[PDB]
Amino acid sequence: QCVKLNDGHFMPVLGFGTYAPPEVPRSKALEVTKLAIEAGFRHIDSAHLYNNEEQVGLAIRSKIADGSVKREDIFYTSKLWSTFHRPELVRPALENSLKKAQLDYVDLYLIHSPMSLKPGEELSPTDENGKVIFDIVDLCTTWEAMEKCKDAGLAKSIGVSNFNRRQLEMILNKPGLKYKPVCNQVECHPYFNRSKLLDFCKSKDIVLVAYSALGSQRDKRWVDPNSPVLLEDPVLCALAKKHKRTPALIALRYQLQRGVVVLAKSYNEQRIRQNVQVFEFQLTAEDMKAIDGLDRNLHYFNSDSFASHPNYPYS
Ligand SMILES: NC(=O)c1ccc[n+]([C@@H]2O[C@H](COP(=O)([O-])OP(=O)(O)OC[C@H]3O[C@@H](n4cnc5c(N)ncnc54)[C@H](OP(=O)(O)O)[C@@H]3O)[C@@H](O)[C@H]2O)c1
Numbered sequence: 001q002c003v004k005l006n007d008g009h010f011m012p013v014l015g016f017g018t019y020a021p022p023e024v025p026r027s028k029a030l031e032v033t034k035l036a037i038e039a040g041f042r043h044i045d046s047a048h049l050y051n052n053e054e055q056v057g058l059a060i061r062s063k064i065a066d067g068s069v070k071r072e073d074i075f076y077t078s079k080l081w082s083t084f085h086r087p088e089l090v091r092p093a094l095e096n097s098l099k100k101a102q103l104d105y106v107d108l109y110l111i112h113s114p115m116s117l118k119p120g121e122e123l124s125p126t127d128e129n130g131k132v133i134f135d136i137v138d139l140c141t142t143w144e145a146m147e148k149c150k151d152a153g154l155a156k157s158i159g160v161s162n163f164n165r166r167q168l169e170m171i172l173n174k175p176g177l178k179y180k181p182v183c184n185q186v187e188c189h190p191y192f193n194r195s196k197l198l199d200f201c202k203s204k205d206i207v208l209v210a211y212s213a214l215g216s217q218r219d220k221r222w223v224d225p226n227s228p229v230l231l232e233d234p235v236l237c238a239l240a241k242k243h244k245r246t247p248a249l250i251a252l253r254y255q256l257q258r259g260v261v262v263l264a265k266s267y268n269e270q271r272i273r274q275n276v277q278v279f280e281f282q283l284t285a286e287d288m289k290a291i292d293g294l295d296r297n298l299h300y301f302n303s304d305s306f307a308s309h310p311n312y313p314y315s
């Protein structure tokens with residue numbers, strides 16, 4: 001149940017979301033990644049930013065050692081954080097991710113965001129007035145250093161995340177481009193379906209990968225508590241009854257039938273196991289059109305300095 005990527009590698013269409021907020025103890029990530037593998041998830045999504053690659057990597061090593069899976073059955077993604085965009089910082093950031101996860105390679109490596117930040121080991125560097133310190137970096141150079149990580153076998157595939165059309169084109173039109181991005185991982189759900197962006201990506205053999213596909217985790221630090229609750233949508237609930245499924249399952253299947261690869265985060269055993277049931281049913285053409293008409297251009301993630309920057313993808 002995979003899609004063939006533009007560099008010849010295979011990406012499982014359903015992936016496990018590993019982020020949890022810092023109030024959740026780091027042992028949980030270990031434990032739920034193991035349950036997700038047990039349930040049948042083979043694609044696993046992490047990042048430097050998430051402070052969990054050690055635990056996610058140890059979960060994977062555990063499922064290999066107990067003979068449930070081999071390394072080559074597992075599709076593991078990490079991301080290059082925006083403090084490491086300068087070309088010389090790229091390979092060491094990747095080697096550092098690999099060392100924490102105790103893996104020899106990632107299956108996929110992404111530029112987490114086009115928005116560059118001040119080099120350092122602060123995740124969020126700020127000045128004396130508490131303002132986020134942005135950096136200016138030619139992203140084409142950052143890309144060339146990603147290409148080099150693929151040539152070196154440290155990343156089987158390389159792609160981007162949180163890019164708009166203009167930013168993709170900048171990579172695609174780069175002189176001497178060796179490797180296209182395999183994918184563009186972006187916020188994508190029935191209230192923000194990204195249809196234009198999706199058609200652009202289909203036209204270049206770039207896979208759109210959907211995050212917050214179930215309506216985000218609604219963390220009060222960066223999601224407006226007044227935003228509508230995706231899984232409480234009436235059209236989705238009505239479709240969950242029709243098919244005898246749940247609204248989350250309607251949300252996930254939507255993305256599969258439109259050719260989006262879809263991530264799903266759950267730290268709850270029963271919801272982890274429920275989510276692999278996306279493969280057990282179909283939506284009709286009409287069902288698909290009913291979900292299409294839910295778009296509200298609603299992004300869950302919002303920051304005081306994100307909606308500000310010269311590389312802000314929504315501007
Ligand atoms: N590239 C980027 O910038 C970026 C940004 C955001 C996210 N991501 C990635 O995308 C992943 C997923 O996105 P997300 O973290 O925003 O969460 P999500 O996949 O939209 O899920 C949101 C919530 O839905 C709940 N849930 C899951 N399955 C369910 C079901 N079957 N029924 C009812 N509720 C269900 C989960 O809560 P429970 O834990 O209570 O089950 C979860 O907190 C992340 O973990 C991360 O790996 C990447």
Ligand SMILES: CCC1=C(C)CN(C(=O)NCCc2ccc(S(=O)(=O)NC(=O)N[C@H]3CC[C@@H](C)CC3)cc2)C1=O
Nearest residue numbers: 019047049050112113123124132162222301303305306
């Ligand atoms: C505005 C961007 C930014 C800084 C500047 C510093 N800083 C940061 O220190 N983080 C705090 C921890 C956190 C926040 C959200 C999530 S998240 O929303 O679950 N996961 C994601 O991967 N991506 C989010 C982060 C990247 C942006 C572009 C898209 C959404 C995971 C972890 C940021 O976030």
